Write a structure and sequence with these properties.
heterotrimer, A: about 45% helix, about 0% strand, B: about 110 residues, four-stranded mixed beta sheet, Ubiquitin-protein ligase E3A (chains B, C), ligase
């Protein structure tokens, strides 16, 4: 929810 | 909470960094030489607390993310994800200075 | 910290709010009259911590998004991203009451 950005670590630990 | 070798074994990278990045190897040369207080200050800056979780620092699954090229801006943090936002500084000396200044503010 | 003017200077709005919305200006009147304890409770509720970042509260980049119409539900937040989810309450007294109950019991 920065999923507000395209950082791959957020998509890995969400 | 001082076994930073266990921290390195589980750390991953983002923004263009890999474990073979020059900036990354300089970083691990720096933090492995940190004192005990500087190690705790780094854990507080990056993760939100100096206490190691049960199972060792490896369970933090720290990420070091490149957020830009060389700059004077200090590194930042994303404590929710245990992410150090680390600009690609042009030297190991500059990296240590900017990293220390960022983590001693508390 | 307590520099809530710098927080207001970098706050962004979404979901139908802008800086000129009536409830938004009422929000800032309320939090600017907050006690020091209530300001720290608001930060802990909205950002996950009551400590100011390096560079002041302006670096938080808070977002106030509209979360449904008038209701007796409390405002929520996504502390990983400094997002305040705020229903469009019908009055300033209701907004103050709902926001105080949310930050004191969480």
């Amino acid at each position: 929810x920065x999923x507000x950005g395209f950082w791959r670590y957020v998509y890995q630990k969400c | 909470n001082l076994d930073f070798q266990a921290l390195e074994e589980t750390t991953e990278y983002d923004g263009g960094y890999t474990r073979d990045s020059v900036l990354i190897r300089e970083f691990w040369e720096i933090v492995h030489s940190f004192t005990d207080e500087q190690k705790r200050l780094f854990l507080q800056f990056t993760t939100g607390t100096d206490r190691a979780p049960v199972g060792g620092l490896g369970k933090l699954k720290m990420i070091i993310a490149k957020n830009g090229p060389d700059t004077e801006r200090l590194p930042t943090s994303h404590t929710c994800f245990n992410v150090l936002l680390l600009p690609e500084y042009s030297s190991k000396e500059k990296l240590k200075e900017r990293l220390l200044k960022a983590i001693t503010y508390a």
